[PDB]
């Protein structure tokens, strides 16, 4: 599920395209998983060991990131394509 199905679910999802005017497009391409990480009150990442999750009533989860390519067309035959990495 993690290695293959998540990537395929994001990829086969329809691209978003919107209009009111400038056209906008969004496309999800690549997926990333860190290790299970805990952010303290200050917000510092640290590797969450599962025993800490058992003791502290946390959830032994890892964050999920995706590269999002936004392509905006301003009805002038141009396309500005900006790719936000690790969203």
């Amino acid at each position: 599920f993690i290695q293959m199905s998540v990537q395929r679910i994001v990829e086969d999802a329809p691209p978003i395209d919107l209009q009111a005017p400038p056209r906008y497009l969004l496309k999800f391409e690549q997926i990333y998983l860190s290790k299970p990480t805990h952010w303290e009150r200050d917000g510092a990442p640290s590797p969450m060991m599962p025993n800490e999750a058992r003791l502290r009533n946390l959830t032994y989860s890892a964050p999920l990131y995706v590269d999002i390519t936004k392509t905006v067309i301003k009805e002038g035959e141009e396309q500005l394509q900006t790719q936000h990495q690790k969203t």
């Binding site: 290695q3 293959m4 998540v6 690549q30 990333y32 917000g43 990442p45 690790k86």
Partner: peptide
């Protein structure tokens, strides 16, 4: 396939 990231490539955006 899903790429793995190390903990050093996680920017501190989750605190901002």
């Amino acid at each position: 396939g899903v790429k793995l990231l190390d903990i050093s490539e996680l920017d501190m955006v989750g605190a901002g």
